[PDB]
Design a protein around this ligand. Sequence first.
Ligand SMILES: O=C(O)CNC(=O)C(=O)O
Ligand SMILES: [Mg+2]
Ligand code: NI
Ligand SMILES: [Zn+2]
Length: 331
Amino acid sequence: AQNPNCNIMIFHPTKEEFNDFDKYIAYMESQGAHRAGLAKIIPPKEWKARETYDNISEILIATPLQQVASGRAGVFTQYHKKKKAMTVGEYRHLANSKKYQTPPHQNFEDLERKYWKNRIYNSPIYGADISGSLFDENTKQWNLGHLGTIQDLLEKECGVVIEGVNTPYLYFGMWKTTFAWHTEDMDLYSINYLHLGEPKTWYVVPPEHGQRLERLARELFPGSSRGCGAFLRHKVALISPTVLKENGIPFNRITQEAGEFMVTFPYGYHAGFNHGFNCAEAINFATPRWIDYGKMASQCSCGEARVTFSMDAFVRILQPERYDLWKRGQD
Ligand SMILES: O=C(O)CNC(=O)C(=O)O
Ligand SMILES: [Mg+2]
Ligand code: NI
Ligand SMILES: [Zn+2]
């Protein structure tokens, strides 16, 4: 078995190997990459996502989210308070302000220490989940707006044609902006490109050990667990590396820098934080190997998780027994 310790693997494809996206994902899996839940892909030196980022300031962040924490430094939840619209140029200026900017630090490890010590005492503002793309249309390789769609994959594998679409999302971050512990909708893959700016630190639990994280989460967030049998679908709970190590939960960490891709694998729980002003693009995708994960994915039916239009068909076809209850939670 390849990668039996479930380490995060880093790949350096050549420009030739960068042509065929599906083939490269299958290659990484042949080497055991998926066992970690997360892999890094450093693009060939010849590749670029677009020519420059000089003209992005007029993108609108219609609903910036202030991430307000509750709990203790290593075990907390966050809620999202909606803020007034602002442009990316306005948000960048805010991120760089004395109130929100990255503090002085020695290295990534020092900054990680400061994040876990101090995150709860601040409320950073995240421009998340913005439909759109920063890839130039002429970028042919690993262009996250030109991927094969999940609907087409389900149709190829299973023969059933379904409604729905699959488009990317932009994320504008600042120091301390946080993504809570989650797997993807329907335990899909994700791919995330850091277009510009400061790094993003990731934590990940191997898929084979995801239920260990779920059991800890039920212990640590006991009211939330009574409220919903899949409350990590709400995407609000944080648990620090120190707490994970105290509780024997297997995990790994890595920092993504500008110009790098990350892939999350089916049922790979992940969480993390941004170092400073940045912009990422991410989208979900599927492969043949996903289908069995999609069939077994948990679902929130309490009403909190509320997701896209396109998830309806996935539930309906892959999980017909759950459909009725899950759809009630959507309506
Ligand atoms: O970058 C973020 O805030 C969150 N991204 C992801 O969870 C992802 O790409 O799967
Ligand atoms: Mg612009
Ligand atoms: Ni994710
Ligand atoms: Zn729920």
